[PDB]
PDB file of C-alpha atoms in Angstrom:
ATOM      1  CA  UNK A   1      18.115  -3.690 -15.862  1.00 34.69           C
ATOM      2  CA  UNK A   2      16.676  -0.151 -16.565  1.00 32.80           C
ATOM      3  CA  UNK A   3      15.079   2.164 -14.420  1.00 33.20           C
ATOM      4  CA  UNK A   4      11.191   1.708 -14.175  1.00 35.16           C
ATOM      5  CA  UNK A   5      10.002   4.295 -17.065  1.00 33.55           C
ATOM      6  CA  UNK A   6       7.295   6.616 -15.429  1.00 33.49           C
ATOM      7  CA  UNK A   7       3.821   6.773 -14.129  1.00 33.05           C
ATOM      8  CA  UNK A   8       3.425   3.201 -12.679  1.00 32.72           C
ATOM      9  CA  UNK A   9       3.842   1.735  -9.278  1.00 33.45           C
ATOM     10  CA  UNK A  10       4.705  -1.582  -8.178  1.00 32.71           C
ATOM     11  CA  UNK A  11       2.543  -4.446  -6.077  1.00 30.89           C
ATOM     12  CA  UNK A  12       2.096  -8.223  -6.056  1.00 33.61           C
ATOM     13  CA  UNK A  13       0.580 -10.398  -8.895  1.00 32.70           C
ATOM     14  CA  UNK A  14      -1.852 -11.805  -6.015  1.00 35.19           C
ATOM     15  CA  UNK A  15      -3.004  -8.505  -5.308  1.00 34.48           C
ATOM     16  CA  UNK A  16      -3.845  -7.650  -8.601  1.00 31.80           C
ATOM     17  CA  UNK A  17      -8.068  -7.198  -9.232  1.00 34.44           C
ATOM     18  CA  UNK A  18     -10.710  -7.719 -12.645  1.00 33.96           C
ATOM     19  CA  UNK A  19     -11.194  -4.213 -13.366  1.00 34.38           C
ATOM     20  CA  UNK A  20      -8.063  -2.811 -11.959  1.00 32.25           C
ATOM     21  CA  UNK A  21      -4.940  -1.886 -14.580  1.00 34.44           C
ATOM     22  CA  UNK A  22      -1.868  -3.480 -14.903  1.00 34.77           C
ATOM     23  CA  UNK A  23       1.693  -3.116 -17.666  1.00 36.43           C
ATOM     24  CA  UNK A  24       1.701  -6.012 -19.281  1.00 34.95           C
ATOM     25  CA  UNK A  25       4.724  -6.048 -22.118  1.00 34.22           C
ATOM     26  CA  UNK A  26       4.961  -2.617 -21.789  1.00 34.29           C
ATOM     27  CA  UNK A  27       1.605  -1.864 -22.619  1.00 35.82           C
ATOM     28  CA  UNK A  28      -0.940  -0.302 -20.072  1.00 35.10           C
ATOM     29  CA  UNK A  29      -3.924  -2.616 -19.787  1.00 35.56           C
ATOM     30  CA  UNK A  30      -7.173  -3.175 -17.806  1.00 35.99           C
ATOM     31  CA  UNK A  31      -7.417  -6.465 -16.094  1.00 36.19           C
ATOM     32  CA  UNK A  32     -10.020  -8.887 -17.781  1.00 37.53           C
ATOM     33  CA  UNK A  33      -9.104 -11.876 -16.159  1.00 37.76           C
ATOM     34  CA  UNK A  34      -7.180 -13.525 -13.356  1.00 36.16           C
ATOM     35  CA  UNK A  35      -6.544 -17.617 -12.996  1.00 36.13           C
ATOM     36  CA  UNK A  36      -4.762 -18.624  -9.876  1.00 33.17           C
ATOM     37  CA  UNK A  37      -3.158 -22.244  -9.552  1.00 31.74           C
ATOM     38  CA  UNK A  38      -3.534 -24.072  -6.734  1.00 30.13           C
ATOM     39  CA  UNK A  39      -0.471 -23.819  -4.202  1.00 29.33           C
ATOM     40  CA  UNK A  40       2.109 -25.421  -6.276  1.00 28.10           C
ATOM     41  CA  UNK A  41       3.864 -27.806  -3.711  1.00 29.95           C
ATOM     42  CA  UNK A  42       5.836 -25.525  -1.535  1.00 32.36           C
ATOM     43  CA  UNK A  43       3.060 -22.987  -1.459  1.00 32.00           C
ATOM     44  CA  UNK A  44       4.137 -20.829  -4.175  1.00 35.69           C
ATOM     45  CA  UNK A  45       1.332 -20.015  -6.650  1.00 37.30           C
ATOM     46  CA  UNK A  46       0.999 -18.914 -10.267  1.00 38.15           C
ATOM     47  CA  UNK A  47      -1.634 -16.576 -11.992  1.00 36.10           C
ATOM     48  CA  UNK A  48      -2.342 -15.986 -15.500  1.00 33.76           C
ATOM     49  CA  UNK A  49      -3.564 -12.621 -16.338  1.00 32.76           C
ATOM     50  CA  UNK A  50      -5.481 -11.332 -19.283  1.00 33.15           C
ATOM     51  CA  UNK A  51      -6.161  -7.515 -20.113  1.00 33.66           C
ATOM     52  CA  UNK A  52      -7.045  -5.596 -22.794  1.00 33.12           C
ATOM     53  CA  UNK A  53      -4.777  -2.014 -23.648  1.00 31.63           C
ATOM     54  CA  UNK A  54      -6.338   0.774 -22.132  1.00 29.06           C
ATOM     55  CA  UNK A  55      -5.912   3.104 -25.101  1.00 26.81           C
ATOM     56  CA  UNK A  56      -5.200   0.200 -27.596  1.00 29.90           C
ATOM     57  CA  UNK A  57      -7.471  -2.607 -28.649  1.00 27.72           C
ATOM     58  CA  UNK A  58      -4.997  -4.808 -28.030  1.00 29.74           C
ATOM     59  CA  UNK A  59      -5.285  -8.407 -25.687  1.00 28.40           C
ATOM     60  CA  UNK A  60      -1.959  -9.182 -23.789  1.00 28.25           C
ATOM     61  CA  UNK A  61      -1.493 -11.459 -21.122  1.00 29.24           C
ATOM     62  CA  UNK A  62       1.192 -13.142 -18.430  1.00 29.29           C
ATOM     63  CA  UNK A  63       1.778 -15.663 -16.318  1.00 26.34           C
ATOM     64  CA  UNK A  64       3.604 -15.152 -12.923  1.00 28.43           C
ATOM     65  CA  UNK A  65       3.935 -16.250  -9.121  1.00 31.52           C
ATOM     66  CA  UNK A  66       1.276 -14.594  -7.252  1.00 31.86           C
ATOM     67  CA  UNK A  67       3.751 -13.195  -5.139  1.00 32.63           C
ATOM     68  CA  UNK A  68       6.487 -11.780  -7.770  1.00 33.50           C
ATOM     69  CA  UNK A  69       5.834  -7.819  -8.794  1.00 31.53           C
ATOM     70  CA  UNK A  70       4.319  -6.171 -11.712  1.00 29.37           C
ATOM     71  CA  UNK A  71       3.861  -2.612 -12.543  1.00 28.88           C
ATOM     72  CA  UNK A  72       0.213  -0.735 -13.036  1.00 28.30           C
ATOM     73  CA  UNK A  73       0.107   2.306 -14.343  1.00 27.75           C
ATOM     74  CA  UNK A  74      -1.386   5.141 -11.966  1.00 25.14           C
ATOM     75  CA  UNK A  75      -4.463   6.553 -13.502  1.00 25.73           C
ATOM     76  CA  UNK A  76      -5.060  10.546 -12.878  1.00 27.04           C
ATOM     77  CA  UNK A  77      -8.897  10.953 -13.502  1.00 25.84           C
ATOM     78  CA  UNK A  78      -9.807  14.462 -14.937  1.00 24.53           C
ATOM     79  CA  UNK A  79     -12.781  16.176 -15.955  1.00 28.21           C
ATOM     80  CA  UNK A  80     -13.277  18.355 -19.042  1.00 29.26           C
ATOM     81  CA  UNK A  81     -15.400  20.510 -21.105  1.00 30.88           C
ATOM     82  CA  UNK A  82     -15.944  19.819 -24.967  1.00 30.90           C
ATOM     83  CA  UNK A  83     -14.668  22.967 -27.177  1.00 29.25           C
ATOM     84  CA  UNK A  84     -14.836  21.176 -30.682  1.00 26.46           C
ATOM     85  CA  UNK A  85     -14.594  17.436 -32.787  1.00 23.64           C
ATOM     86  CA  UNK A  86     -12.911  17.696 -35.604  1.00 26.34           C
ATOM     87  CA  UNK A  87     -11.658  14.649 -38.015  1.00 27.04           C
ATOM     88  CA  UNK A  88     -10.237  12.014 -35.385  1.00 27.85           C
ATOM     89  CA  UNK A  89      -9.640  14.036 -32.171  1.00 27.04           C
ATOM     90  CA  UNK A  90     -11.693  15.931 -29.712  1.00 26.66           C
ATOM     91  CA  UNK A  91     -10.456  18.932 -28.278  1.00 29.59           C
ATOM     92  CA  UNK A  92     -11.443  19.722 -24.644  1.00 32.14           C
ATOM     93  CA  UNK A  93     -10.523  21.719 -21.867  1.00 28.80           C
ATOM     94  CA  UNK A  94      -9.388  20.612 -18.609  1.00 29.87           C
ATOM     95  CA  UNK A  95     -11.725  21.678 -15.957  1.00 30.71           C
ATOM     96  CA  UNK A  96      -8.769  22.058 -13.384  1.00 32.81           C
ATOM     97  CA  UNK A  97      -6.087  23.988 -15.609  1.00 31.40           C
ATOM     98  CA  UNK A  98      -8.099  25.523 -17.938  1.00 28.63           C
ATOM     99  CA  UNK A  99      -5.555  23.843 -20.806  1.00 24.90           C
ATOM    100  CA  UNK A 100      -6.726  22.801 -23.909  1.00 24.68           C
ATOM    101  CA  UNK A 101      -5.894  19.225 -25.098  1.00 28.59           C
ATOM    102  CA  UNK A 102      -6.595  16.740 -27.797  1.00 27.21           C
ATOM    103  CA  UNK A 103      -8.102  13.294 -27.107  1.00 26.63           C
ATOM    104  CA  UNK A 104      -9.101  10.633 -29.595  1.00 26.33           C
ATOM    105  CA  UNK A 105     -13.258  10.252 -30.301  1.00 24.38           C
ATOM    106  CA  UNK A 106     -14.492   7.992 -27.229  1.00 26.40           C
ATOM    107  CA  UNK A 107     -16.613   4.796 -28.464  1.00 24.57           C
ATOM    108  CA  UNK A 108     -19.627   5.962 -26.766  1.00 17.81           C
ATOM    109  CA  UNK A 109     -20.246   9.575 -28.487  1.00 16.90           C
ATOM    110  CA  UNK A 110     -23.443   9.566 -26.860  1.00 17.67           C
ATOM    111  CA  UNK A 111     -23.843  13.343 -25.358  1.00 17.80           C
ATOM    112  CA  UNK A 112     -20.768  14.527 -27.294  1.00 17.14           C
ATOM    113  CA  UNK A 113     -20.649  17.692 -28.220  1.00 18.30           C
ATOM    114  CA  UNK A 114     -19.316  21.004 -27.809  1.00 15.46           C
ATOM    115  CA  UNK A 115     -20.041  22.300 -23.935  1.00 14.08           C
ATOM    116  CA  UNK A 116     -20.507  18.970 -23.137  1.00 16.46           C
ATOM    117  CA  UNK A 117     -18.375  17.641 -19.965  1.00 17.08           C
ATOM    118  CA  UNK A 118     -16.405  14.358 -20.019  1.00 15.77           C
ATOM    119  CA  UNK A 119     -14.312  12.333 -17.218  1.00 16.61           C
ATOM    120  CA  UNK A 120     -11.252  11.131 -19.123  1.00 18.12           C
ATOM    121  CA  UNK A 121      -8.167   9.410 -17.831  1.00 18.33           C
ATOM    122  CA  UNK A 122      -4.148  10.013 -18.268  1.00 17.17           C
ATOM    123  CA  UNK A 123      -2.011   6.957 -17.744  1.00 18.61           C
ATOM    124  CA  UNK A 124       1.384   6.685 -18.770  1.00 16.87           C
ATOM    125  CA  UNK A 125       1.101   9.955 -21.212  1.00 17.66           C
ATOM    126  CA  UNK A 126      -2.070   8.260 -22.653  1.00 17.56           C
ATOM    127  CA  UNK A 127      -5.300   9.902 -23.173  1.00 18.39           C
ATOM    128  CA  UNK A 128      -8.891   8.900 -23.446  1.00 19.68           C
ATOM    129  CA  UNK A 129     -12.487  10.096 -22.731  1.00 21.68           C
ATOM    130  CA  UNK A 130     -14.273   7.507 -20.557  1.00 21.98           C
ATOM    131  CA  UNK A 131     -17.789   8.515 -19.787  1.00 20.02           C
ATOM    132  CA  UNK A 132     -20.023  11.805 -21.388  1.00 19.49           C
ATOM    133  CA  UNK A 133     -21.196  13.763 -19.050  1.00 16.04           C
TER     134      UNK A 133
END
């Protein structure tokens, strides 16, 4: 029941890749691992999937038929400039809209710093920096 809330699309378990994102309990993840059972005995198949939140350090996981559907979130990858850190967030400027946002401090701080450029992500109505520079 429910409408599928926002900002994901949907495609089969058996399609799903390490690496690649998917909703797991309601929370946006990254795929970590994938199991896949051998063809059960009319050729259906399970897979277990592991991931780890994308803005959360949180593990989740699921079980499901390969061919049943999940929901990923879809990832908009952006690109902005460093305008200040203060405390626990670091304000930037999207290179596109010229807006100024608020993002949490990334893990690798590496090249941080004001007039610095960063790719970050949106997912979902998430934020995050993911690579300096």
């Amino acid at each position: 029941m429910v409408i599928i809330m926002p900002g994901t699309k949907q495609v089969n378990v058996g399609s799903l890749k390490v690496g690649q994102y998917v909703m797991i309990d309601g929370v946006p993840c990254e795929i970590v691992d994938i199991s896949v059972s051998k063809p059960g005995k009319h050729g259906g198949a399970k897979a277990r999937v592991v991931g780890i939140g994308i803005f959360e350090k949180v593990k989740k996981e699921f079980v499901a038929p390969t061919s049943s559907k999940v929901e990923v979130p879809i990832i908009d990858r952006r690109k902005g400039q460093v305008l200040a850190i203060m405390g626990d967030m670091v304000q930037i400027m999207d290179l596109q809209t010229y807006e100024t946002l608020e993002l949490p401090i990334p893990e690798g701080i590496e090249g941080l710093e004001p007039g610095g450029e960063v790719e970050y992500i949106e997912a979902v109505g998430q934020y995050k920096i993911t690579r300096v520079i």
